[PDB]
């Protein structure tokens, strides 16, 4: 119950949240980019044949 | 003006920012996903008719 101790403990928790939030943000952004790339590739493949 | 008090007050502010940032990130990601889904649905609907 030291005045510094229950502050050090909260300092421990106040950084894993930031780290995990960054990780989830990166995962979401990468998934969105991959989906967009797959969609554009399929669209181009479909688009060539009708022109020909 | 207690040495712990003006630290507790800053600890108060140093978490709502993280919470709101997470909320805004989720909102943006969901909006992007919904837009992509709407675009792909419309593209598929347009794509079937020209093939037929």
């Amino acid at each position: 119950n030291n005045n510094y101790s229950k502050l050090r403990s909260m300092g421990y928790a106040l950084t894993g949240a930031v780290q995990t939030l960054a990780q989830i943000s990166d995962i979401n952004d990468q998934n969105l980019q991959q989906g967009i790339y797959l969609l554009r590739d399929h669209i181009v493949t479909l688009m060539e044949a009708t022109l020909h | 003006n207690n040495n712990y008090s003006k630290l507790r007050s800053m600890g108060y502010a140093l978490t709502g920012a993280v919470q709101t940032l997470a909320q805004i990130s989720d909102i943006n990601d969901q909006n992007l996903q919904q837009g992509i889904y709407l675009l792909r649905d419309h593209i598929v609907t347009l794509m079937e008719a020209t093939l037929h």
Partner: peptide, 13 residues
């Protein structure tokens, strides 16, 4: 959410 809640719990005492 639990981490932020514990952060807010580690200050009311």
């Amino acid at each position: 959410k639990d981490q932020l809640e514990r952060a807010k719990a580690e200050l009311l005492r």
